[PDB]
Amino acid sequence: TVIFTEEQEALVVQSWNVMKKNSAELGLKLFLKIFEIAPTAKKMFSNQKLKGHAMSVFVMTCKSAAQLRKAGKVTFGESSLKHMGSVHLKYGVVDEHFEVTRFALLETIKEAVPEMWSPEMKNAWAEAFNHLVAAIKAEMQRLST
Ligand code: HEM
């Protein structure tokens, strides 16, 4: 497991509560940053699907932070992990795409809540994001065999 503190969860929960006021705009900013860095990713999404996908990234990472605090591990149901993993595989999503998305997510948060930004805030989001991404792949691995 990992030790993910009440303070770390509160950073994620509290910044998301502030950013939620502008969730549609923030979702667009996230994808604008992703597509600025790696425009080739735009082809995967050839917009209401972009809106839903950005919201999934934010809300699913938030829920991963809550599960890390509560359980030391990500506890998403297997059908949800299996869906994300199969869809990502189908579309050719590889590690670099997750890495660019993480980078863009953290930049987006930093600009959305400059008054809360700090190394601790960055690391709390990043840890929750990384554990969700790893959890999808561990579920896809349980099914590769
Ligand atoms: C932790 C990070 C991510 C989470 C939580 C996440 C979540 C999701 C979910 C819930 C879906 C299903 C949408 C549906 O069934 O309609 C989905 C689909 C998809 N994801 Fe992700 N995703 C992540 C990362 C990525 C990344 C890094 C890429 C590529 C840069 C990507 C590209 C796609 C595409 C192309 C689809 C299918 C089209 C769409 O639903 O818009 N995803 N993702």
Side-chain angles (χ1 to χ4, degrees), residues 11-12 23 38 41-42 44 74 81 110 121 123 131 142:
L11 288 169
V12 171
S23 65
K42 229 185 310 192
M44 270 159 179
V74 156
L81 293 174
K110 176 180 179 146
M121 168 74 79
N123 290 346
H131 276 82
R142 282 223 92 82

Side-chain angles (χ1 to χ4, degrees), residues 55-78:
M55 262 284 270
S56 298
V57 171
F58 278 111
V59 177
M60 292 279 277
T61 301
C62 187
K63 294 184 178 171
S64 167
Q67 300 164 17
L68 294 192
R69 206 272 317 153
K70 184 180 183 121
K73 65 155 136 206
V74 156
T75 67
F76 277 114
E78 177 181 329

Side-chain angles (χ1 to χ4, degrees), residues 44-45 53 83-84 87-88 91 93 97-98 101 129 132-133:
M44 270 159 179
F45 296 93
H53 192 275
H83 177 65
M84 275 178 311
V87 168
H88 288 156
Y91 281 84
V93 177
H97 300 118
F98 285 103
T101 292
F129 183 98
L132 168 58
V133 174

Side-chain angles (χ1 to χ4, degrees), residues 35-127:
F35 290 154
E36 182 187 8
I37 298 166
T40 283
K42 229 185 310 192
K43 291 173 187 172
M44 270 159 179
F45 296 93
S46 314
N47 176 312
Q48 291 307 112
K49 310 232 177 188
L50 287 190
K51 294 246 197 71
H53 192 275
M55 262 284 270
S56 298
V57 171
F58 278 111
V59 177
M60 292 279 277
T61 301
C62 187
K63 294 184 178 171
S64 167
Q67 300 164 17
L68 294 192
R69 206 272 317 153
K70 184 180 183 121
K73 65 155 136 206
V74 156
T75 67
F76 277 114
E78 177 181 329
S79 290
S80 302
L81 293 174
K82 198 172 162 191
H83 177 65
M84 275 178 311
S86 313
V87 168
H88 288 156
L89 183 68
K90 154 175 181 183
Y91 281 84
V93 177
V94 297
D95 290 333
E96 285 97 329
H97 300 118
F98 285 103
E99 290 163 9
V100 167
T101 292
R102 188 182 59 217
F103 180 87
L105 173 63
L106 297 169
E107 290 295 317
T108 298
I109 294 166
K110 176 180 179 146
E111 287 158 42
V113 290
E115 80 278 0
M116 314 176 66
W117 186 248
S118 70
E120 292 67 32
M121 168 74 79
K122 182 185 183 158
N123 290 346
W125 278 98
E127 194 79 84

